Write a protein that binds this DNA or RNA. Structure first.
Lengths: 108, 108, 333, 305, 333
DNA sequence: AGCAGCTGCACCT
DNA sequence: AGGTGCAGCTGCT
RNA sequence: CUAAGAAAUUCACGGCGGGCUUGAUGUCCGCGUCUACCUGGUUC
């Protein structure tokens, strides 16, 4: 629960602090983090710039953050075969369930 | 007090070392006569002089360079608070801190 | 009646820390994206050049002592090697209500002081003191060593009412000297604004920018800090210069000292020019103190004779008492 | 000490040269007694004429830097001092030490008055923010607006008017513009239960603040004990050590129309939280209470968790 | 009468840090977009080569110490392999007002000190000192080890008034030696300009570029930095070179030391080259002090006899005192 | 014909 | 980049 | 009505001379990515 809030504050102060956000290296691949933890429109705001990340469904970022969180909490047959890995996955699910509601009230 | 008197406090501070007459310098003069080796008036003057360490010794006053803040009452006027410096609490915390920093068991 | 045992005044005319950036002349009107100057480090090595002792000179010992030099590491700040000028920016607010103390013990001393300040303001305004305070904004005394040797210093001052500019002022800081106080047709509007803000209604906000054409790659002089040093084998000092967010800066009290250089009425001479308004008026770059208490021209005895015994001094020396009431301080019996 | 009728934002207060030491035992952020005294002074200078009451304060620290230095690679820090004027004889003066800091904070206030009903909200918010930008908060002056940016105008959120879903969406709206930093709350019950857990050795409470502001490692018969957050030792009011005097008794008093008392600090525990992880925004607010029969003058944050 | 207890002066010749870049000869007129010289690092493996104390100079100890090599990492700066010239560029400004101190306690001392300096400047101008100062910009002495063994050195000097060029000078730095002070017709215009700056009647800002033809890929020599930790055997960094934003450079005090190599008046010799002006004029490479205080020819003896007792110390030695005042420092007690 | 002040010196961990 | 207490002195009274 | 109220750290400076980092080397074996779909966004 503390590790979620540190990432929230780092996304709120890191990209939001610097007043610049150019095109990412490899924009076909570096666009998920550049869309989620990215700023609003700027001087390079094209026609499909202010109508792409604010109009699209901002709910893939929760599963993308859960995919990063799955690496930190190690899983295997030692935990998945027991009944503690199910609760250890359900706690991360209950934490990342608010990641689309608290992390999706800006654009949508 | 003044610094020039501080060495005299050493003569008032040796009564807790070796002997047990640290409270025997002024009153209970059985240890203050065979070890004092004086008359009765000299013993009375010494008992009056060494008992003045623990006295009040001052009229209740403050200064213009002290703090004196205001504090609000529940639905009334105010109170003037004059905070002082906790010498003894600071000395106790300092003695608890330097031993944890360096000492016998902390270094072992 | 007597003097209150607890007496205190609050600082009016408080500035902020000024920030330093760099760029080129004839683009100074678009100087909002100019990059900041930064503090770096370098190493120096010198030899014995101090006035050594009167009997330990010893012409074989000086040769043996010259072979071991000194070695340091210092902080330093320069302009970039393509930038021409230096920009110094700060803000100032005038606070108003310059007669009322922040703390006073008696109720009779308080009203006697109140009516004394009331007769002063009713007889003459704050116009002389504001005309002298606006000079150190019209010229650029607040850049201390950055003003020496420059070929062009200009100052832009703008007044801020809402989130927009109400009025603007542009000066040429090298024409207005550092010795006399003369009244121009443009300095009087700023003096009237400072005098209206100093009379009690609220606060008045100004923003002061100074541009100094200093060279190209030359070094600049921010404030340096006072620390109690390290004392080990490592490098003890860096001759540390002051920074806000990786940008070289000047302190607030140094600019406040530069704005206060007012009184030419001290009884030594006006050969040193104006000094800063202090009780027992002393100069740190001079080692000594004018306005000694052996004469009757310090702050305490003048206020004691003006409030208690009711003998008003000369109209020149009436400005000095109001000046270090605007300055502030803690005084007690 | 009621639930406030409205909340008042003060969005980004930049303070220069505040007081850093704040206690005879700590040196970090300034004490919250400064913030409660600031809002009481603001009440005395505005709310008597605008017919409102201000009692609560919420301290969200956006950023913080201190005038400190690091000597010789030692594991300590010192304070950068200022240069005082010369003496009367003209040699030098003795040095007293004080620490200064540059902070940027936000303050949410609670309004209980009846002035809300007869006047527009934005006028009250604008007049409070305009009057607040002319005095100081912690010994350091409040810096005004800078050019080339859009400034933040403060708003008046209404708490006791509306539906509950609209309430929760307004409280989720106002937490958007105050998330960069964190909030500070008090933890008396947590310190009490942690004293009662390890009470089998020594029941002195002062050896508990000095057991949570350290890094304790009892290794294997390499592990670090799980810190539940960011626990900091703070000053938590005053405690008297002298009887109450009369308005003329003590000389050199600040005012000769108010009784005086000598006083020691009291030390408690506090915590820095993210603003998302609270239920409502009125749980944060700091209040102060006095028991003049005793000597207990204490500020704390009630109605939190 | 005695000397004041606070007496400080500031420097009147301000140079900057001299940055270096590289290119090809016969294109030095288009050398504005030449790329800079960068600092790299490499590995060295040395052997023992110092004197042995003949206490542990055994036949087996030396062979044992040979097998354990010392491995270090050093910084190095070379020219590119398609470029043969080095270009060094800096700016300089001459301030003037070289008699008035920066701080002074006594007012009876500073008035007669200003009287002494004023009778010097009225008796003879700044022409000799400015001639000897312009010589050290003509022959490129500020390239210290980048000047030995060079094929050709050429120096351009500009005069800047606004963002324009007022006058230009070109010199062959190898024809003008490092020994004599011989007057040309083109060097005297530069000497007149530097004296006009030092006197106070004008603002003087110069920029100096020096080209040195060395060879393709050869090694250049920037300023060397202090390494705080003791040199440690087996891979420790051993030397570091000075830099600005990814470009090698020379310190400002090192190219300032090569401008005040002026005085030939020291009593040891005059045909062994000019040395730098200093109190107790000393070379740290030689390990000795000319102008010992046992004679009467150091700065603190001549200054204290010229002001306190009014004993002029001969025209030749009067340029030494004024050059020391142009240098700066804290004199007195 | 003394009050008040003031300077300067010494003591001390 | 010491504070406090006392011996001595002045000086016009 | 805020551990409230107050404050100039400054003047000058040559880091520097030398150097051999080397000698050998096997990354191997095996594998099912499948099912669906109107751009008639306003590629201004």
């Amino acid at each position: 629960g503390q590790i979620c809030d540190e990432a929230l504050q780092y996304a709120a102060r890191l990209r939001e602090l610097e007043p610049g956000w150019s095109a990412t290296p490899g924009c076909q691949l570096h666009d998920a983090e550049q869309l989620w933890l990215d700023p609003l429109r700027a001087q390079t705001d094209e026609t499909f710039l202010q109508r792409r990340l604010r109009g699209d469904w901002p709910a893939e970022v929760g599963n993308r953050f859960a995919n990063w969180l799955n690496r930190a909490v190690s899983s295997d047959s030692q935990i998945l075969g027991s009944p503690e890995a199910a609760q250890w996955s359900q706690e991360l699910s209950k934490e990342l369930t608010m990641f689309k509601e608290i992390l999706e009230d800006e654009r949508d | 007090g003044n610094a020039a008197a501080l060495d005299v406090f050493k003569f008032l501070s040796l009564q807790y070392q070796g002997k047990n007459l640290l409270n025997w310098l002024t009153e209970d003069s059985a240890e203050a006569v065979q070890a004092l080796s004086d008359n009765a008036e000299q013993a009375r003057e010494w008992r009056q002089a060494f008992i003045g360490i623990t006295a009040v010794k001052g009229a209740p006053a403050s200064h213009s360079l002290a703090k004196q803040l205001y504090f609000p009452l529940p639905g009334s006027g105010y109170h003037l608070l004059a905070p002082l410096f906790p010498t003894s609490l600071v000395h106790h915390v300092h003695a608890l801190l330097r031993e944890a920093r360096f000492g016998d068991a902390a270094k072992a | 009646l007597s003097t209150a045992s607890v007496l205190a005044f609050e600082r009016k005319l408080d500035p902020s820390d000024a920030l330093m950036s760099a760029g080129a002349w004839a683009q100074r009107d678009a100087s909002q994206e100019w990059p900041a100057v930064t503090v770096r480090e370098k190493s120096v090595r010198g030899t014995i050049s101090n006035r050594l002792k009167t009997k330990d000179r010893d012409p074989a010992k000086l040769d043996a002592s010259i072979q071991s030099p000194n070695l340091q590491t210092v902080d330093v700040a320069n302009l970039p090697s393509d930038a021409d000028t230096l920009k110094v920016r700060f803000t100032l607010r005038v606070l108003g209500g310059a007669g009322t103390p922040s703390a006073c013990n008696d109720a009779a001393y308080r009203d006697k002081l109140l009516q004394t300040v009331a007769t002063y303001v009713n007889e003459q305004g704050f116009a002389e003191l504001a005309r002298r305070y606006a000079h150190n904004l019209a010229n650029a005394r607040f850049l201390w060593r950055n003003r020496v040797g420059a070929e062009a210093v200009e100052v832009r001052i703008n007044h801020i009412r809402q989130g927009e500019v109400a009025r603007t002022w542009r000066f040429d800081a090298l024409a207005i000297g550092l010795r006399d106080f003369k009244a121009d047709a443009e300095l009087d509007a700023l003096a009237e604004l400072i005098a209206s803000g100093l009379s009690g209604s609220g606060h008045v906000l100004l923003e002061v920018v100074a541009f100094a054409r200093i060279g190209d790659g030359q070094e600049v002089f921010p404030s340096q800090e006072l620390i109690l040093d390290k004392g080990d084998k490592k490098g003890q000092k860096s001759k540390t210069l002051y920074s806000v967010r990786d940008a070289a800066a000047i302190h607030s009290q140094k600019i406040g000292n530069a704005l206060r250089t007012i009184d030419t009425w001290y009884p030594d001479e006006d050969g040193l020019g104006p000094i800063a308004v202090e009780p027992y008026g002393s100069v740190t770059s001079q080692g000594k103190a004018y306005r000694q208490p052996k004469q009757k021209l310090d702050f305490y005895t003048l206020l004691d004779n003006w409030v208690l015994r009711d003998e008003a001094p000369a109209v020149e020396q009436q400005h000095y008492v109001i000046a270090n009431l605007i300055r502030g301080g803690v005084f007690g019996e | 000490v009621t639930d406030p009728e409205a909340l008042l934002l003060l969005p980004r207060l930049s303070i220069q040269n505040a007081n850093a030491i704040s206690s005879p035992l700590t040196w970090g952020f300034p004490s919250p007694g400064a913030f409660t005294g600031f809002v009481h002074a603001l009440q005395r200078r505005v709310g008597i004429s605008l017919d409102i009451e201000l009692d609560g304060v919420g301290i969200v620290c956006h950023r913080f830097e201190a005038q400190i230095s690091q000597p010789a690679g030692k594991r300590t820090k010192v304070f950068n001092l200022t240069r005082n004027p010369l003496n009367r004889d003209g040699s030098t003066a003795a040095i007293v030490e004080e620490g200064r800091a540059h902070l940027e904070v936000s303050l949410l206030l609670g309004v209980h008055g009846d002035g809300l009903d007869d006047h527009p909200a934005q006028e009250i918010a604008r007049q409070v923010q305009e009057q607040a930008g002319a005095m100081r908060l912690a010994g350091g002056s409040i810096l005004p607006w800078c050019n080339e940016r859009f400034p933040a105008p403060n708003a008046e959120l209404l708490m006791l008017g509306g539906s509950d879903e609209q309430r929760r969406k307004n409280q989720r709206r106002l937490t958007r513009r105050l998330l960069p930093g964190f909030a500070l709350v008090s933890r008396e019950a947590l310190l009490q239960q942690h004293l009662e857990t390890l009470r089998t050795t020594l029941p002195e409470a002062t050896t508990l603040d000095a057991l949570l502001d350290l890094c304790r490692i009892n290794f294997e018969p390499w592990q670090v004990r799980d810190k539940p957050g960011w626990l900091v030792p703070i000053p938590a009011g005053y405690n008297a050590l002298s009887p109450l005097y009369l308005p003329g008794e003590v000389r050199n008093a600040r005012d000769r129309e108010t009784p005086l008392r000598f006083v020691e600090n009291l030390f408690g525990l506090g915590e820095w939280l993210s603003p998302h992880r609270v239920a409502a925004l009125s749980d944060l607010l700091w209040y102060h209470h006095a028991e003049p029969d005793k000597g207990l003058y204490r500020w704390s944050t009630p109605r939190f968790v």
